[PDB]
Ligand binder design. Structure first.
Ligand code: UYC
Ligand code: CL
Length: 230
């Protein structure tokens, strides 16, 4: 029933929107048309809205020529403003996420964080915790929004932060929860990681622990999360 499923999508219950979206996408032209109209009425986003990310990504994931063409033409930069306090280009990150190429997205994200930190970090290819503390909130919001919107809320530093808070800020409890350690065994980069949505909540983006937790803690304590309601 397309009418009733459309109504379910346009009602205000997030949980019921998500089941309606999944059903509509499998209902051919009529269902896909309802989803395309939902994007037209809700994109560009101002604030991240999970259901809108799910509509976009569900349609991309069909990998059908005409839908993909239409999405690229109407939403060439995706659904979320690609804003940066340093003029950085986040389109390649968006493109990797829209293709569900999470490994490429992780690599791009790591490079962009060094670019954001400046020439010293770009040169050495790793961060100091004080550089993280000084990141502009806007860039972290753009980066996180893309991860979250393109992963059904499963990925993003905001997701890790809330799991870290749920763990009493105990990093040794966080690592197993996000799949980065299994008992005594550290998940080996890159081959040990799960580069798809079967991964546990918070699995990506990665934060190497070779130089300790200081970068991750500074990232999770950054004012961006409270500022933007993450
Ligand atoms: C021995 C055990 C450890 C270890 C070793 C190590 N990691 C390396 C690289 C590297 N690991 C990650 C990610 C992770 N690696 C993990 O184990 C985990 C689970 C917490 C994550 C999430 C990324 C993204 C890069 C590329 C970016 C970068 O190099 O920073 C290198 C090569 C260093 C080099 O060649 O210079 C070495 C030797 N890393 C650790 O976390 C533990 C304690
Ligand atoms: Cl550090």
């Amino acid at each position: 029933n397309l009418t009733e499923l459309s109504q379910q999508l346009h009602d205000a219950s997030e949980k019921k929107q998500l089941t309606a979206i999944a059903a509509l996408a499998e209902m051919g032209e009529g269902g896909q048309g309802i989803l395309l109209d939902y994007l037209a009425k809700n994109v560009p986003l101002e604030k991240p809205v999970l259901a809108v990310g799910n509509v976009y990504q569900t349609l991309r994931n069909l990998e059908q020529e005409t839908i993909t063409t239409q999405l690229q033409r109407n939403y060439p930069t995706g659904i979320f403003p690609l804003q940066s306090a340093q003029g950085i280009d986040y389109l390649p990150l968006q493109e990797a996420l829209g293709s569900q190429d999470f490994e490429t997205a992780d690599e791009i994200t790591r490079d962009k964080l060094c670019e954001l930190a400046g020439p010293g970090a770009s040169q050495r290819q790793w961060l100091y915790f004080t550089e993280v503390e000084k990141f502009p909130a806007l860039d972290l919001h753009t980066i996180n929004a893309l991860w979250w919107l393109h992963s059904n809320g499963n990925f993003g530093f905001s997701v890790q932060r809330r799991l870290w808070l749920a763990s009493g800020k105990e990093f040794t409890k966080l690592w197993p929860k996000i799949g980065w350690k299994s008992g005594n065994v550290w998940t080996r980069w890159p081959k040990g990681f799960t580069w798809d949505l079967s991964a546990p909540q918070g699995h990506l983006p990665l934060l190497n622990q070779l130089r300790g937790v200081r970068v991750a803690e500074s990232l999770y304590r950054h004012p961006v999360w409270s500022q933007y309601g993450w």
